Design a binder for these strands. Sequence first.
DNA 1: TATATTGCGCAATATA
DNA 2: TATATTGCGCAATATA
Lengths: 68, 64
Amino acid sequence: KHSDEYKIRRERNNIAARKSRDKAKMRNLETQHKVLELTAENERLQKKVEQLSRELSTLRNLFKQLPE
Amino acid sequence: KHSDEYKIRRERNNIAARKSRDKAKMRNLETQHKVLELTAENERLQKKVEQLSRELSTLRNLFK
DNA sequence: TATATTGCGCAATATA
DNA sequence: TATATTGCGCAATATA
């Protein structure tokens, strides 16, 4: 077209495009930050599982050394 | 309207630009998938914590 | 009718 | 010389 209506629609779409690109770029930043939070939580849970597993294994071996 | 050197340079750059943004899109999707991986893994580890705590409490009840 | 989404072309820019 | 990167825009598509 390349008329007055075309120039107006292109101006509005260029604004919407930049706004949509900003939203996606921000969503990628929140996703990267969420990986850091989940990784720290994952390391805390691994240490807790390891601690309880050793505590349960020691108690189980303690019960198995018991006579009839 | 355009020289042959320009048409070939633009043809090669379109391949590079598409290849470059294809990898960037895959890296962004990998970060999104890592959220799903860690979320399901943290849920599994929390269930393992609760399982070990129950097995500890059940075994300690055998004292008396 | 409107905005939102996005692969693509472009050229400036970065890098090899 | 070359490819790699990327911020506008464009236009086809999706959505309201």
